[PDB]
Point group: D2
């Protein structure tokens, strides 16, 4: 009797191929089902009964399919106030159904508000100190009202919860800032502002299970240091533990480093060792499925 792994991801990656031949306890095979958040739905009962429906409208000329995923791998962003959608209810549904996940459904749900995730980093920063964990000095605004000025310029204003660059606005002066402030009022949601950092390069330190990799963007794989490891290790402990994550940091011309954010299981695979990362995620998942 085979185990069913549901992978929530865009079609770009053929997960069935990297999971092929992988067996649980060296006996049980794994059937890989792959879909995007938008193509899934479900019903969950407190008695354990459930059903995850896949597609409806997609290739195959319309078809309704029922799966009973034994495990889930979430490689896609669960929420976005623009071009993505609100899948927070699906995450809730998966948790209600008691389906094991990577990353945990708990972390996925809690990752729905970027500044909520950032708030965790503020606590680590408070504890560790700048010499150990140099978090960028960002400002959170629950509501636009008091967005008067920015202590300096330019300032990057990040609006609501957006990904891959969306919702960001570089503001070079007091007047332009005030314009964006009004736009923030029209969004009916919070936003953050942070000083603009004139950087020499970007660094992303990733952690998949127990495997670490550091890449330098300006992508070149650079050596890991205890400093880098501390950043990602501490970050990987948030929301009960992140199995797949990465810390994005900038290296200022000023010499100082600045931690910008931490990304979860939907973190894009980068560099030229993408097949290594993919294979590591497979071993991680398989191992969790066995011990589940």
């Amino acid at each position: 009797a085979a185990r069913v792994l549901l992978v929530i991801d865009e079609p770009h990656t053929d997960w069935a191929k990297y999971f092929k031949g992988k067996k649980i306890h060296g006996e049980i095979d794994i059937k890989v089902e792959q879909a995007e958040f938008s193509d899934l739905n479900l019903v969950a009962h407190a008695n354990g009964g459930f059903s995850v429906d896949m597609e409806v409208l997609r290739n195959g000329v319309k078809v309704v399919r029922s799966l009973k995923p034994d495990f889930v791998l979430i490689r896609q962003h669960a929420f976005s106030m623009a071009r993505n959608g609100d899948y927070r209810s699906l995450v809730i549904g998966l948790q209600y159904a008691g389906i094991p996940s990577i990353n945990s459904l708990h972390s996925v749900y809690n990752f729905c508000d970027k500044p909520w995730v950032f708030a965790q980093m503020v606590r680590l920063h408070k504890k560790l100190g700048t010499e150990e964990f140099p978090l960028i000095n960002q400002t959170f605004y629950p509501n636009h009202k008091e967005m008067l000025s920015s202590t300096t310029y330019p300032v990057v204003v990040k609006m609501g919860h957006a990904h891959s660059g969306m919702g960001k606005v570089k503001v070079d002066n007091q007047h332009d800032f005030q314009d964006i402030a009004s736009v923030v009022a029209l969004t009916k949601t919070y936003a953050t502002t942070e000083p603009f950092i004139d950087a020499k390069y970007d660094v992303r330190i990733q952690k998949i299970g127990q495997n670490y990799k550091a890449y330098m963007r300006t992508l070149e794989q650079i050596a890991m240091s205890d400093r880098y490891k501390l950043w990602v290790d501490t970050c990987s402990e948030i929301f009960g533990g992140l199995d797949i994550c990465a810390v994005e940091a900038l290296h200022g011309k000023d010499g100082r480093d600045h931690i910008i954010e931490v990304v979860g299981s939907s973190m894009p695979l980068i560099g030229d060792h993408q097949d290594e990362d993919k294979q590591l995620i497979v071993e991680l998942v398989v191992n969790k499925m066995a011990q589940a």
Copy 2:
């Protein structure tokens, strides 16, 4: 130098009075600031700077006040898709500011989706079993589409995230159910359905710090049992630990008990020992302020 406690609650309760004379370490006094979620705002910086603004429009003929709360006591519901508002961003702001709270800001934030809270109880139910933890067999619907029938009738449909009864609808038959199903589609949010329980009485088992009380509604204070204690103790462990909480359960004419839900720090104080509860919350908070 006195400690500042911000209490988020409706005006009904004079918290300043129950906190009067209470001192931290027997030395430091406590200044109690009390407001409703709707009358507060803030700005938080990752460097630790922050400011919680109180009122603007309220008694005193308009006034803007700044507080630097050292601690917060949350006695009000943080989110409601009807008659209350969305204060989830304020909770995020308070966490971003690193302000200690009761209950924890983490639990308060995670309590914003009732079915997400219920999902925790499903896991405990799965683990403990019905003989130990009799959770009602509720059904979660991420999205209306598949709301065809209810295995039985009547069925109580709870819509989105509402409190104090709001958003509930008792549906006695297949046809009326289908009407409500359409209303759920028009809500653009999830809902749950559960079999209607013809009850002899209601029971609410509460836990404030280490003090337990059980009340029976039909309110009469009834003795605690190891069964009752297990329900509330297990429930109090969710989202890292709830300092103030209660489990609502129904006692069916059928003899079987049914756990309905768990409420957080905003749980209403009931019965005739309301001043005891109030005094217990004070000792709890004061103790946390000292060790903070």
Copy 3:
């Protein structure tokens, strides 16, 4: 070709662990070499930089035979302590932890399991929290030594001495005078003891938990599991950070009630008919842990 991950299994020779592990591979690739010895036959040196060595000396036929190894993981199926000559392997447990070697059960739990009443103390806390109706722990008494052993409130009483096991070091005393005799014997052990009301029992029950597999045996007959039984073993399995292999021993007295006596760790004997199936469950557990490290 490609090196094998070495698993050290600390157990008596009666069970051939290499056989149940044969063909089992990590990530479906890496082979496992199973080394098996007893605590007595082991020594080690551990450095804080990560360097280490676990040497074996099982004097089986060959005299003074030392075969050195380097374990990637350890499976502890033998009791680490005894108040009898050659009964202390606590320093080895400390050495294994000092070497950072992953284990089942955790080295932390194994070390903490060295004093039975310390383990019992954990159950006392669970009992205090859950209550008798949920967790009926026997009303045992701890004496850090013989000085306060003037009397017991009820007799007969079973007196358990310092570190015994396999039902040893147990003595049932029936009266005040005989109790005072045993009290002197306890002094001669220069160690602590416990006393508990004798429970004339109808049957014994052992609820076991290996990973996520549960089995309940009666005293053998495999009885069904109940939420009550599960709660006992689940709660007990959370002690000392989590026990991967454990079981709760309980009596069903002639009185018609249940009594929790103790909890055993990874060295718990495999009983009943399903001994091979549980051995394989232990194999699957260990392999999966090895893959995670």
Copy 4:
């Protein structure tokens, strides 16, 4: 009138704890009665039903004087073990846990602090995770006993024996031959030992943590705290479920680098000028814990 909550403080007579606790009240209402004795002078009986008794016998002037008490809380300021006559109070610690009595530090940590290398083993894990650039732990070697002590890679070397303390049981050996002499002495202790490269040191540093208060002393001069120092003590304070009172001892060698030697628990000596302020910090800590229970 209204009964007082009894606090038992296990410490030598040099510090008058009753004085620093005087007038301190729980919830601003309840009074605290402070009982103070040493481990040697204590015995107890604990029952799983919650019944218990902690009897005192401080033979100060009066012979065979027993004053019985019932502690609501315990403050452990004395080292629970020593490989010297009358050095084992591990059974008392087990008895206190069996009695469910709340403590500072936790009884769990106190019990686990009985074997220094077991405590060190925790630091080895932190060191392995953090790396030398973040957490520079000295490269110490553990020997479960004398048999594997053939040689050391570098000499001189400080050999620390089984359970010593206050800088005792320490021996600096300079060569292969002298090392072999000490190896035999270790055999005569029938216990484990550790060896570490001698570090000719410029100065000593002790980073302490009492609740949320930090202080760093140099060897006395109070130096400022740094994020590096804080990380060392914060990480160390998380061991064994959390240490409320602790400190990390580190050397700054003549070599111009830092070396972490060890971490001490609630029995850590109060040093420097701020001894009274730290005593009061300990008082505030304890009182607040008493109120929570």
